[PDB]
Amino acid sequence: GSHMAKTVILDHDGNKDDFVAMILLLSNPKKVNLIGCICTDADCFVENGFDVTGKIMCAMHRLIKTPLFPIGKSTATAVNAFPTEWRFSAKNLDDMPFLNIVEDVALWEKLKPENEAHNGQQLLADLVMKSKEKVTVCVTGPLSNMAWCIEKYGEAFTSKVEECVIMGGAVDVGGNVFLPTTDGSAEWNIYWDPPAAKKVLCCPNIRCVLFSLDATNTVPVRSVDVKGFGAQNQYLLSQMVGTMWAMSTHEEILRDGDAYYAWDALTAAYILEPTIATLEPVALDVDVSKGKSEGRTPRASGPCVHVARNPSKQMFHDLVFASTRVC
Amino acid sequence: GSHMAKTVILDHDGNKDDFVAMILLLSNPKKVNLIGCICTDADCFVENGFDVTGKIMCAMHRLIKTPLFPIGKSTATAVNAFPTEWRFSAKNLDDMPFLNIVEDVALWEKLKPENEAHNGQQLLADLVMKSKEKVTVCVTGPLSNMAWCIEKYGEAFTSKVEECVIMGGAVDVGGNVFLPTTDGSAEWNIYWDPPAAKKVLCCPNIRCVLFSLDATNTVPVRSVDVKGFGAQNQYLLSQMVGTMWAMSTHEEILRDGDAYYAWDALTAAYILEPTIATLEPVALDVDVSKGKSEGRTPRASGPCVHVARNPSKQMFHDLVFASTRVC
Ligand SMILES: OC[C@@H]1[C@@H](O)[C@@H](O)CN1Cc1csc2c(O)ncnc12
Ligand SMILES: OC[C@@H]1[C@@H](O)[C@@H](O)CN1Cc1csc2c(O)ncnc12
Ligand SMILES: [Ca+2]
Ligand SMILES: [Ca+2]
Ligand code: NI
Ligand code: NI
Ligand code: NI
Ligand code: NI
Ligand code: NI
Ligand code: NI
Ligand code: NI
Ligand code: NI
Ligand code: NI
Ligand code: NI
Ligand code: NI
């Protein structure tokens, strides 16, 4: 819990909570050795999500001396794109004053070209396959990169994965994909690339921990708690996380307008503290059709993954607030 | 320019640039004595815009010892409401870490009840009418409060106004109100309450300086300049203004996606530096109909206001960057 670090790669798609997840992982080097990040052109414009990833890496390196690591833009493309207005969030982040501290801009400008050479899917494969320790992959965007690696390399890749902790799906609760052509039963990360999700979630060669809407619905961050970051504004990570949650737009804001979803952050929190939730083994039948139920992750007839259940609000809160006083 | 301060009231509707305007005024006490603020339930939920106003007042009082002042919620209601998603911005701001510094929250919690007793329209009238100096009113929301004061008090009020510097309208360029029932010719602040605008803009008893889209269209803040606030992140006002502009959503973001509108900020900048723009006397015929042209501010047949022209991008930039190093 403080004596040995897990080797971790973050496979993300650049929304505000992807970066909260990144900050939780990177701010806890006693627990997590972050050896790389992948960014997918899903809930962001990949150039923006890439730059924000880079600058956060640079800021942590400067402040707390966490190692620098390779970052790769995936070339995976969507089956179903995220709404364009949502994807702009990483551009907004890239313009934020806490992501434009002069040292971080200078270091990222220097490190950017070497990272631009990487292909994200290939980087994920290379980092896992060449690692001495088995690697924990945290997936907070769609499952396309994991799918590509499993398809290209099979057990040469999956044998080197410790576990895969994924944000996606909706098992016993409704989804969050509301479009003229959908029934509302699907979750967005799955919907973006349903065949990828089908390939990964039911891959018998990896241990998947799934943070579906079942778990994420129960742990919003209330406005009253987001305001708590103000007491820590002298810490860069509090300026970052407080702003990331305060910026919530569209369906990131719950019904009552006084709380926000924290989907990916809870997912990374599990890597820091596995007791934050109980796990249930579940067989899933991923809908890859073009019907209204496309992307649905219902229980199969007759396991694929271990679904997170009843996550601890207090543990989540305490972890996030401690992590964001790190620097 | 540094030897005597203008007495000013800010009559605003709580969008991000309203607060940039507020920060420009309040950060320059050599030039501006801010004696009050009004908040209207237009481009915000008035409770949120009120709280943000209060906390910014409190922060400046703490940091640079600017005086505290009365703040009043207007009870004016719209003819045509702003889009609900846009109005949430002040709620997002109210949750920001730089607007939750513990001292500011404590002081605002203390000062809030006395201010809640105020009626905004009445406060605007009282502050102008009892002021020893003639008062400059900066209006960055709709014209409803000015209209109410002129209707209730006539010259007893207008004789005590130095000038009224207003953000609104579109004279020789298109508007920004795009709805199924509009032709695109109107600007939002006017559209919100066209009869109020008609009453004020052509009131022969006040000198109106109008920052219409003609002027505001030419002074966006580019992403490259918003990023400049990062170099000043140690200053609270840079964290505020940088985030306010970086947060831009919807039609605040220009076509190319690399710049944002700064409508109200330019309007306040004129109070700080009147040479920032050239003024043209223009007679206007405000459309108060329920047709597609409702809220249009075309040139009349045959002056009402002095329209701002060709504002200086460099002066605006230099003023904003200096103001946001104040604290
Ligand atoms: O399905 C949740 C996943 C998480 O991994 C978050 O990054 C948002 N992402 C998509 C998403 C669902 S609603 C919503 C929203 O309202 N804005 C931006 N993104 C989203
Ligand atoms: O017509 C411009 C006035 C200014 O006073 C700004 O506060 C925004 N306000 C309304 C407005 C126009 S487009 C737009 C937008 O996209 N988001 C929020 N507000 C607006
Ligand atoms: Ca995500
Ligand atoms: Ca305004
Ligand atoms: Ni340990
Ligand atoms: Ni170094
Ligand atoms: Ni490399
Ligand atoms: Ni929208
Ligand atoms: Ni695919
Ligand atoms: Ni707490
Ligand atoms: Ni002077
Ligand atoms: Ni005091
Ligand atoms: Ni009073
Ligand atoms: Ni009215
Ligand atoms: Ni400059």
Side-chain angles (χ1 to χ4, degrees):
Chain A
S2 50
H3 69 312
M4 65 188 185
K6 294 177 191 177
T7 298
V8 176
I9 296 167
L10 178 61
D11 176 359
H12 78 81
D13 68 339
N15 187 35
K16 299 158 294 288
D17 63 326
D18 298 85
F19 296 115
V20 177
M22 189 189 170
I23 288 168
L24 295 177
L25 300 170
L26 194 50
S27 63
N28 283 281
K30 287 177 203 59
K31 290 176 158 305
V32 169
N33 177 28
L34 193 65
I35 68 163
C37 287
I38 324 297
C39 191
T40 299
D41 198 34
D43 210 11
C44 75
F45 299 112
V46 64
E47 193 69 7
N48 303 322
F50 182 62
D51 281 334
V52 172
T53 308
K55 289 189 293 182
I56 292 176
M57 172 184 73
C58 287
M60 299 253 51
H61 179 67
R62 176 173 54 85
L63 286 168
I64 59 158
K65 319 299 186 297
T66 42
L68 297 171
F69 46 84
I71 304 166
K73 294 180 291 180
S74 169
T75 55
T77 61
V79 172
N80 300 299
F82 273 97
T84 205
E85 298 293 299
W86 299 6
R87 292 181 70 203
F88 205 90
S89 285
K91 188 69 171 46
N92 294 128
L93 287 175
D94 189 42
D95 285 355
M96 290 283 165
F98 51 83
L99 280 163
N100 288 99
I101 299 286
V102 297
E103 288 78 8
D104 306 330
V105 173
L107 182 58
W108 180 237
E109 169 171 48
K110 175 193 162 191
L111 303 175
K112 180 171 183 168
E114 194 194 346
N115 288 298
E116 210 139 53
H118 295 139
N119 171 260
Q121 301 94 301
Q122 190 70 60
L123 181 64
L124 177 58
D126 294 343
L127 288 170
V128 172
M129 289 170 68
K130 296 305 215 173
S131 178
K132 294 182 177 66
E133 302 303 63
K134 283 184 191 179
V135 176
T136 295
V137 186
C138 184
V139 178
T140 61
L143 283 160
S144 313
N145 303 312
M146 285 294 291
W148 184 95
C149 292
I150 294 165
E151 179 162 16
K152 184 167 184 78
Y153 295 107
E155 266 271 86
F157 173 85
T158 63
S159 67
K160 292 289 304 184
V161 176
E162 178 74 5
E163 55 177 352
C164 181
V165 182
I166 305 163
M167 195 282 127
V171 183
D172 301 310
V173 298
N176 70 9
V177 175
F178 309 117
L179 292 171
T181 54
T182 68
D183 62 5
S185 72
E187 180 281 330
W188 267 105
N189 292 353
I190 312 302
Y191 186 73
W192 200 79
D193 190 346
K198 184 170 165 62
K199 193 89 174 61
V200 180
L201 290 180
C202 295
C203 182
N205 315 281
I206 57 169
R207 301 294 158 276
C208 295
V209 172
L210 192 65
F211 277 77
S212 61
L213 299 185
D214 308 62
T216 69
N217 283 351
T218 71
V219 190
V221 183
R222 306 166 294 154
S223 158
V224 83
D225 291 295
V226 176
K227 283 181 156 65
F229 292 104
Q232 304 181 169
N233 194 61
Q234 61 274 14
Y235 296 108
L236 188 67
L237 295 188
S238 288
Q239 184 183 351
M240 299 204 182
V241 171
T243 307
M244 285 168 187
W245 278 330
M247 277 170 92
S248 301
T249 49
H250 310 114
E251 305 161 16
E252 299 172 315
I253 309 155
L254 279 79
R255 316 215 136 289
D256 46 35
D258 63 39
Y260 314 111
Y261 287 118
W263 310 271
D264 300 351
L266 181 66
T267 311
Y270 173 85
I271 295 181
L272 297 179
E273 292 294 338
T275 66
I276 199 169
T278 303
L279 299 183
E280 181 208 347
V282 179
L284 296 175
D285 189 12
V286 180
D287 193 315
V288 299
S289 80
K290 307 305 300 189
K292 288 190 189 58
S293 292
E294 182 177 3
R296 201 192 289 185
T297 63
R299 291 177 179 271
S301 284
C304 289
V305 303
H306 295 81
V307 182
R309 304 288 184 192
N310 310 325
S312 168
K313 291 173 169 66
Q314 193 65 59
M315 289 178 86
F316 180 68
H317 178 273
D318 289 354
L319 287 165
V320 173
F321 278 83
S323 297
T324 58
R325 293 190 289 268
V326 166
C327 61
Chain B
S2 50
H3 69 312
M4 65 188 185
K6 294 177 191 177
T7 298
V8 176
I9 296 167
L10 178 61
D11 176 359
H12 78 81
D13 68 339
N15 187 35
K16 299 158 294 288
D17 63 326
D18 298 85
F19 296 115
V20 177
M22 189 189 170
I23 288 168
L24 295 177
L25 300 170
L26 194 50
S27 63
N28 283 281
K30 287 177 203 59
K31 290 176 158 305
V32 169
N33 177 28
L34 193 65
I35 68 163
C37 287
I38 324 297
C39 191
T40 299
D41 198 34
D43 210 11
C44 75
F45 299 112
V46 64
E47 193 69 7
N48 303 322
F50 182 62
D51 281 334
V52 172
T53 308
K55 289 189 293 182
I56 292 176
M57 172 184 73
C58 287
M60 299 253 51
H61 179 67
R62 176 173 54 85
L63 286 168
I64 59 158
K65 319 299 186 297
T66 42
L68 297 171
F69 46 84
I71 304 166
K73 294 180 291 180
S74 169
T75 55
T77 61
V79 172
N80 300 299
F82 273 97
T84 205
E85 298 293 299
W86 299 6
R87 292 181 70 203
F88 205 90
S89 285
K91 188 69 171 46
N92 294 128
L93 287 175
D94 189 42
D95 285 355
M96 290 283 165
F98 51 83
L99 280 163
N100 288 99
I101 299 286
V102 297
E103 288 78 8
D104 306 330
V105 173
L107 182 58
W108 180 237
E109 169 171 48
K110 175 193 162 191
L111 303 175
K112 180 171 183 168
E114 194 194 346
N115 288 298
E116 210 139 53
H118 295 139
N119 171 260
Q121 301 94 301
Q122 190 70 60
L123 181 64
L124 177 58
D126 294 343
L127 288 170
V128 172
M129 289 170 68
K130 296 305 215 173
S131 178
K132 294 182 177 66
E133 302 303 63
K134 283 184 191 179
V135 176
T136 295
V137 186
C138 184
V139 178
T140 61
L143 283 160
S144 313
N145 303 312
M146 285 294 291
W148 184 95
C149 292
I150 294 165
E151 179 162 16
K152 184 167 184 78
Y153 295 107
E155 266 271 86
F157 173 85
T158 63
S159 67
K160 292 289 304 184
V161 176
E162 178 74 5
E163 55 177 352
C164 181
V165 182
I166 305 163
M167 195 282 127
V171 183
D172 301 310
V173 298
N176 70 9
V177 175
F178 309 117
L179 292 171
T181 54
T182 68
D183 62 5
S185 72
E187 180 281 330
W188 267 105
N189 292 353
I190 312 302
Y191 186 73
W192 200 79
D193 190 346
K198 184 170 165 62
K199 193 89 174 61
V200 180
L201 290 180
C202 295
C203 182
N205 315 281
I206 57 169
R207 301 294 158 276
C208 295
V209 172
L210 192 65
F211 277 77
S212 61
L213 299 185
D214 308 62
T216 69
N217 283 351
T218 71
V219 190
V221 183
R222 306 166 294 154
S223 158
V224 83
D225 291 295
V226 176
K227 283 181 156 65
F229 292 104
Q232 304 181 169
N233 194 61
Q234 61 274 14
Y235 296 108
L236 188 67
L237 295 188
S238 288
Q239 184 183 351
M240 299 204 182
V241 171
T243 307
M244 285 168 187
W245 278 330
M247 277 170 92
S248 301
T249 49
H250 310 114
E251 305 161 16
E252 299 172 315
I253 309 155
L254 279 79
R255 316 215 136 289
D256 46 35
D258 63 39
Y260 314 111
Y261 287 118
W263 310 271
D264 300 351
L266 181 66
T267 311
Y270 173 85
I271 295 181
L272 297 179
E273 292 294 338
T275 66
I276 199 169
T278 303
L279 299 183
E280 181 208 347
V282 179
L284 296 175
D285 189 12
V286 180
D287 193 315
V288 299
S289 80
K290 307 305 300 189
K292 288 190 189 58
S293 292
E294 182 177 3
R296 201 192 289 185
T297 63
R299 291 177 179 271
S301 284
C304 289
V305 303
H306 295 81
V307 182
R309 304 288 184 192
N310 310 325
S312 168
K313 291 173 169 66
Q314 193 65 59
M315 289 178 86
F316 180 68
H317 178 273
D318 289 354
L319 287 165
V320 173
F321 278 83
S323 297
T324 58
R325 293 190 289 268
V326 166
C327 61

